[PDB]
Amino acid sequence: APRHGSRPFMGTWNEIGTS
Amino acid sequence: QAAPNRPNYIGFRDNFIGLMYYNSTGNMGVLAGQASQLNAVVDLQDRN
Amino acid sequence: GTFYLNHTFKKVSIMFDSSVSWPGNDRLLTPNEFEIKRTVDGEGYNVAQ
Amino acid sequence: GTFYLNHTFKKVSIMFDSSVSWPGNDRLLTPNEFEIKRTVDGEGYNVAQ
Amino acid sequence: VAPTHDVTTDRSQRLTLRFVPVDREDTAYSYKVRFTLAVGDNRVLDMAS
Amino acid sequence: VAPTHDVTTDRSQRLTLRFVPVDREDTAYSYKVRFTLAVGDNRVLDMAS
């Protein structure tokens, strides 16, 4: 399991973007 | 003498109501999976 | 045993606890109810003539 | 070698042992009768114009 | 006493399916119809039906 | 800023795909159509549109 998918493709303000 | 006739703006149905046969147990519809004929719309004739 | 009114029955619905149909899962062409007479209209669910 | 009558042929049928058929297992469009002239055009065969 | 062991499936299933033609054709003397008879997994159909 | 990547098809997908009836039926007072609405693998469709 040599990685994490996560999910950040959300526009982007800075290091951010969700909820 | 004379006058105008009245005016009946005879045009189509807001929401396009009717043009699709909605709740009715005869004509009804389907959306299943070419692979099971298992329909997924059961419209009991009582939901307007 | 001289029954002669069995062709006037159109729909039959069997519900347990008024919220679950007996055949249930999918075992019919209309999940809620068994149908006997489909004569008002048909999309194909009739038997020989 | 001046053969000139082949414009008149309509069908041939090879059959070995009175049962089999040499354009064999279906390989064809009419899998049992070599069609050389379809004058009842229909399903759609009829090559060139 | 009828058998209770694994003979009749409990998971949701349909005991009769409607298959509609996927492709066809029309001719003055023929009507081709092509069906996809996909049988669900873990369930056996009998052609006699 | 917008997402850099991983949200955009890079090969030839089709916005506003079109479908036309594979089956038609007309009665004196009704019109019946059915489309083979094929979403296609690696995709997701919302029927709101």
Short mmCIF file of C-alpha atoms in Angstrom, two decimals:
data_model
loop_
_atom_site.label_atom_id
_atom_site.label_comp_id
_atom_site.label_asym_id
_atom_site.label_seq_id
_atom_site.Cartn_x
_atom_site.Cartn_y
_atom_site.Cartn_z
CA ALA A 1 0.00 0.00 0.00
CA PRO A 2 2.67 2.49 -1.04
CA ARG A 3 0.47 5.57 -1.18
CA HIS A 4 -2.55 7.53 -0.20
CA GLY A 5 -5.20 8.80 -2.70
CA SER A 6 -6.82 11.55 -0.51
CA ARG A 7 -8.71 13.94 -2.62
CA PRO A 8 -7.98 17.51 -3.21
CA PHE A 9 -9.06 18.73 -6.56
CA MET A 10 -11.32 21.53 -5.59
CA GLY A 11 -10.46 24.71 -7.07
CA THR A 12 -7.85 25.79 -4.58
CA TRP A 13 -7.55 28.79 -2.31
CA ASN A 14 -4.32 27.70 -0.56
CA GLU A 15 -3.50 24.20 0.68
CA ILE A 16 -7.25 24.13 1.13
CA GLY A 17 -10.70 23.63 -0.40
CA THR A 18 -13.53 21.46 0.95
CA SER A 19 -16.83 21.68 2.86
CA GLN B 1 -72.80 45.88 -36.28
CA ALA B 2 -69.75 44.00 -35.19
CA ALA B 3 -66.93 43.25 -32.80
CA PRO B 4 -63.86 41.51 -31.97
CA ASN B 5 -63.81 37.85 -31.22
CA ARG B 6 -62.28 37.01 -27.92
CA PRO B 7 -58.90 35.54 -27.58
CA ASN B 8 -57.62 32.15 -26.77
CA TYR B 9 -53.93 31.99 -26.64
CA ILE B 10 -53.94 28.16 -27.48
CA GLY B 11 -50.36 27.23 -26.83
CA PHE B 12 -48.41 24.42 -25.25
CA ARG B 13 -48.43 23.33 -21.59
CA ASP B 14 -46.24 25.00 -18.95
CA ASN B 15 -43.91 22.31 -17.65
CA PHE B 16 -44.78 20.55 -20.85
CA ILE B 17 -47.45 18.73 -18.88
CA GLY B 18 -48.79 15.74 -20.49
CA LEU B 19 -46.38 15.48 -23.34
CA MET B 20 -44.96 12.69 -21.32
CA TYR B 21 -47.22 9.92 -19.98
CA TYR B 22 -46.70 10.09 -16.38
CA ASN B 23 -48.51 8.33 -13.71
CA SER B 24 -50.70 5.77 -15.49
CA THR B 25 -50.58 2.05 -15.51
CA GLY B 26 -51.06 1.50 -19.04
CA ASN B 27 -48.66 3.53 -20.88
CA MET B 28 -45.76 3.82 -18.38
CA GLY B 29 -41.99 3.65 -18.89
CA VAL B 30 -38.71 2.09 -18.16
CA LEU B 31 -35.05 2.57 -17.50
CA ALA B 32 -33.47 -0.81 -16.93
CA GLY B 33 -30.40 -2.43 -17.77
CA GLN B 34 -30.07 -4.02 -21.19
CA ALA B 35 -29.30 -7.06 -19.31
CA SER B 36 -32.22 -7.88 -17.18
CA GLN B 37 -35.18 -6.14 -18.37
CA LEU B 38 -35.59 -5.18 -14.63
CA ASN B 39 -37.44 -1.85 -14.87
CA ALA B 40 -37.09 0.86 -12.39
CA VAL B 41 -39.93 2.94 -12.57
CA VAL B 42 -43.16 1.69 -10.97
CA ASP B 43 -45.62 4.53 -11.10
CA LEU B 44 -48.63 3.69 -9.00
CA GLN B 45 -51.50 5.50 -10.53
CA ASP B 46 -51.89 7.81 -7.60
CA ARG B 47 -48.97 10.08 -7.36
CA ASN B 48 -49.69 13.17 -9.30
CA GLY C 1 -68.05 -25.80 -5.52
CA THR C 2 -70.13 -24.16 -8.26
CA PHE C 3 -68.00 -21.03 -8.46
CA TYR C 4 -68.68 -18.92 -11.52
CA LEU C 5 -67.18 -15.50 -10.64
CA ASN C 6 -63.42 -15.81 -10.97
CA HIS C 7 -62.99 -13.61 -14.05
CA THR C 8 -64.01 -10.39 -12.27
CA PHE C 9 -60.83 -10.21 -10.16
CA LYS C 10 -58.35 -7.62 -11.41
CA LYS C 11 -55.69 -6.91 -8.78
CA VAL C 12 -54.57 -8.69 -5.63
CA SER C 13 -52.19 -7.12 -3.11
CA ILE C 14 -50.83 -9.08 -0.15
CA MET C 15 -49.06 -7.06 2.53
CA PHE C 16 -47.54 -8.22 5.81
CA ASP C 17 -47.70 -5.57 8.54
CA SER C 18 -49.22 -3.21 5.95
CA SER C 19 -45.70 -2.29 4.83
CA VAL C 20 -44.17 -5.38 3.17
CA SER C 21 -45.48 -7.17 0.11
CA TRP C 22 -45.30 -10.94 0.48
CA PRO C 23 -43.56 -11.93 -2.78
CA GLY C 24 -41.55 -8.84 -2.09
CA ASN C 25 -38.14 -8.73 -3.61
CA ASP C 26 -38.93 -8.77 -7.31
CA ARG C 27 -40.83 -11.99 -8.02
CA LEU C 28 -43.40 -10.38 -10.32
CA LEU C 29 -43.67 -7.98 -13.23
CA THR C 30 -45.33 -5.57 -10.80
CA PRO C 31 -43.64 -5.82 -7.40
CA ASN C 32 -46.50 -4.56 -5.23
CA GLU C 33 -49.36 -6.63 -6.60
CA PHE C 34 -50.39 -9.74 -8.46
CA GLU C 35 -52.41 -8.89 -11.56
CA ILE C 36 -55.20 -11.04 -12.98
CA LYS C 37 -56.98 -8.88 -15.56
CA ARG C 38 -54.81 -6.45 -17.52
CA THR C 39 -57.40 -5.31 -20.04
CA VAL C 40 -57.66 -1.52 -19.73
CA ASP C 41 -54.25 -1.28 -21.41
CA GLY C 42 -51.31 -3.54 -22.09
CA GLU C 43 -47.63 -3.14 -22.78
CA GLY C 44 -47.40 -6.88 -23.43
CA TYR C 45 -48.30 -8.60 -20.16
CA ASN C 46 -51.14 -10.83 -21.31
CA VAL C 47 -51.43 -14.55 -21.95
CA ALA C 48 -52.74 -16.40 -24.97
CA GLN C 49 -55.55 -14.37 -26.55
CA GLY D 1 -12.95 -21.15 -74.84
CA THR D 2 -15.61 -18.82 -76.20
CA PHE D 3 -18.06 -19.69 -73.43
CA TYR D 4 -20.80 -17.08 -73.62
CA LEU D 5 -23.84 -18.54 -71.83
CA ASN D 6 -22.76 -18.19 -68.20
CA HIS D 7 -24.99 -15.16 -67.98
CA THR D 8 -27.66 -17.82 -67.64
CA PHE D 9 -27.17 -19.82 -64.43
CA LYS D 10 -29.21 -19.42 -61.28
CA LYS D 11 -28.23 -21.99 -58.66
CA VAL D 12 -26.07 -25.05 -58.00
CA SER D 13 -26.17 -27.49 -55.12
CA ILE D 14 -23.27 -29.77 -54.22
CA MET D 15 -24.32 -32.66 -51.99
CA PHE D 16 -22.02 -35.56 -51.13
CA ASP D 17 -23.39 -38.92 -50.01
CA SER D 18 -26.86 -37.55 -50.77
CA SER D 19 -26.90 -35.89 -47.35
CA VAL D 20 -23.89 -33.54 -46.72
CA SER D 21 -23.36 -30.13 -48.47
CA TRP D 22 -19.90 -28.93 -49.60
CA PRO D 23 -20.09 -25.32 -49.10
CA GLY D 24 -20.13 -26.75 -45.80
CA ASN D 25 -20.85 -25.83 -42.22
CA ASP D 26 -22.61 -22.55 -43.16
CA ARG D 27 -19.89 -20.92 -44.81
CA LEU D 28 -21.85 -18.99 -47.20
CA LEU D 29 -24.86 -16.70 -47.08
CA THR D 30 -27.19 -19.28 -48.53
CA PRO D 31 -25.50 -22.10 -46.67
CA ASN D 32 -26.72 -24.90 -48.92
CA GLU D 33 -27.32 -23.52 -52.42
CA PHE D 34 -24.68 -21.59 -54.35
CA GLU D 35 -26.54 -18.48 -55.50
CA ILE D 36 -25.35 -17.05 -58.79
CA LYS D 37 -28.42 -15.07 -59.79
CA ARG D 38 -30.99 -13.64 -57.35
CA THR D 39 -33.99 -12.35 -59.31
CA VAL D 40 -36.20 -12.23 -56.21
CA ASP D 41 -34.11 -9.56 -54.56
CA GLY D 42 -35.07 -8.96 -51.01
CA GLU D 43 -33.00 -9.59 -47.88
CA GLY D 44 -30.37 -7.70 -49.64
CA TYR D 45 -27.94 -9.70 -51.40
CA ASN D 46 -27.11 -8.59 -55.01
CA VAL D 47 -23.46 -7.30 -55.20
CA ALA D 48 -22.61 -4.82 -57.68
CA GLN D 49 -25.11 -2.80 -59.14
CA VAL E 1 -42.85 -31.25 4.74
CA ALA E 2 -41.28 -29.05 2.10
CA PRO E 3 -37.50 -28.61 2.23
CA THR E 4 -36.19 -25.51 3.95
CA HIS E 5 -32.52 -25.99 3.07
CA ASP E 6 -30.90 -24.01 0.26
CA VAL E 7 -33.34 -24.63 -2.58
CA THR E 8 -35.16 -21.29 -2.99
CA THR E 9 -33.04 -18.15 -2.95
CA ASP E 10 -33.83 -15.42 -0.44
CA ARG E 11 -31.84 -12.67 -2.15
CA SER E 12 -33.98 -10.42 -4.31
CA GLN E 13 -34.70 -12.12 -7.62
CA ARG E 14 -37.16 -12.00 -10.49
CA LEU E 15 -38.79 -15.23 -11.64
CA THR E 16 -39.68 -13.90 -15.11
CA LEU E 17 -37.90 -11.32 -17.24
CA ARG E 18 -38.98 -9.27 -20.24
CA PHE E 19 -36.41 -9.20 -23.05
CA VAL E 20 -36.79 -6.55 -25.75
CA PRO E 21 -35.08 -6.85 -29.16
CA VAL E 22 -31.68 -5.21 -29.40
CA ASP E 23 -31.66 -5.11 -33.21
CA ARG E 24 -34.00 -6.34 -35.91
CA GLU E 25 -35.02 -5.87 -39.53
CA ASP E 26 -38.20 -5.76 -41.59
CA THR E 27 -38.83 -7.29 -45.01
CA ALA E 28 -41.87 -8.06 -47.13
CA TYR E 29 -41.40 -11.73 -46.21
CA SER E 30 -39.17 -11.83 -43.11
CA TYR E 31 -38.67 -10.27 -39.68
CA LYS E 32 -35.29 -10.83 -38.05
CA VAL E 33 -35.08 -10.34 -34.29
CA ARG E 34 -31.86 -10.44 -32.26
CA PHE E 35 -32.06 -10.90 -28.49
CA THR E 36 -29.55 -10.71 -25.67
CA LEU E 37 -30.57 -13.55 -23.34
CA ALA E 38 -28.23 -12.63 -20.49
CA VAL E 39 -28.93 -15.03 -17.62
CA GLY E 40 -28.12 -13.74 -14.17
CA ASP E 41 -25.15 -15.15 -12.32
CA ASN E 42 -25.80 -18.06 -9.95
CA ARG E 43 -29.13 -18.95 -11.55
CA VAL E 44 -30.03 -21.38 -14.31
CA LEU E 45 -32.58 -20.82 -17.06
CA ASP E 46 -34.35 -23.66 -18.84
CA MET E 47 -34.86 -23.10 -22.56
CA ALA E 48 -38.16 -24.96 -22.34
CA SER E 49 -39.25 -21.71 -21.02
CA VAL F 1 -7.18 28.57 -8.69
CA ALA F 2 -8.85 25.60 -10.33
CA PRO F 3 -7.77 21.97 -9.92
CA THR F 4 -4.62 21.28 -11.90
CA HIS F 5 -5.66 17.87 -13.22
CA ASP F 6 -7.43 14.59 -12.45
CA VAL F 7 -10.69 16.31 -13.23
CA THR F 8 -10.82 16.47 -17.01
CA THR F 9 -11.11 13.85 -19.72
CA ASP F 10 -8.06 14.19 -21.91
CA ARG F 11 -9.17 12.02 -24.82
CA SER F 12 -12.18 12.40 -27.10
CA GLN F 13 -15.25 12.34 -24.88
CA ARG F 14 -18.52 13.87 -26.04
CA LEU F 15 -20.46 16.65 -24.36
CA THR F 16 -24.20 16.47 -25.11
CA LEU F 17 -24.11 12.98 -26.59
CA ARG F 18 -27.13 12.34 -28.80
CA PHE F 19 -29.35 9.28 -28.87
CA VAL F 20 -32.10 8.37 -31.34
CA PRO F 21 -34.84 5.75 -30.98
CA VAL F 22 -33.89 2.12 -31.58
CA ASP F 23 -37.60 1.23 -31.38
CA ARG F 24 -40.73 3.19 -32.21
CA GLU F 25 -44.44 2.65 -31.78
CA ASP F 26 -47.28 4.97 -32.73
CA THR F 27 -50.94 4.60 -31.80
CA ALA F 28 -53.88 6.82 -32.65
CA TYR F 29 -53.33 8.73 -29.40
CA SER F 30 -49.83 7.92 -28.11
CA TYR F 31 -46.17 7.79 -29.08
CA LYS F 32 -43.80 5.11 -27.78
CA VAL F 33 -40.00 5.29 -28.01
CA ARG F 34 -37.11 3.48 -26.36
CA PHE F 35 -33.45 4.45 -26.56
CA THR F 36 -30.37 2.35 -25.84
CA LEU F 37 -29.03 5.01 -23.49
CA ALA F 38 -25.47 3.71 -23.18
CA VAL F 39 -23.53 5.64 -20.55
CA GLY F 40 -20.28 3.98 -21.55
CA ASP F 41 -17.55 2.68 -19.30
CA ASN F 42 -15.36 5.13 -17.38
CA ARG F 43 -18.05 7.79 -17.04
CA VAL F 44 -20.92 9.01 -14.90
CA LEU F 45 -24.21 10.47 -16.10
CA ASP F 46 -26.78 12.60 -14.30
CA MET F 47 -30.30 12.38 -15.73
CA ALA F 48 -31.09 15.89 -14.52
CA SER F 49 -29.62 17.00 -17.86
#
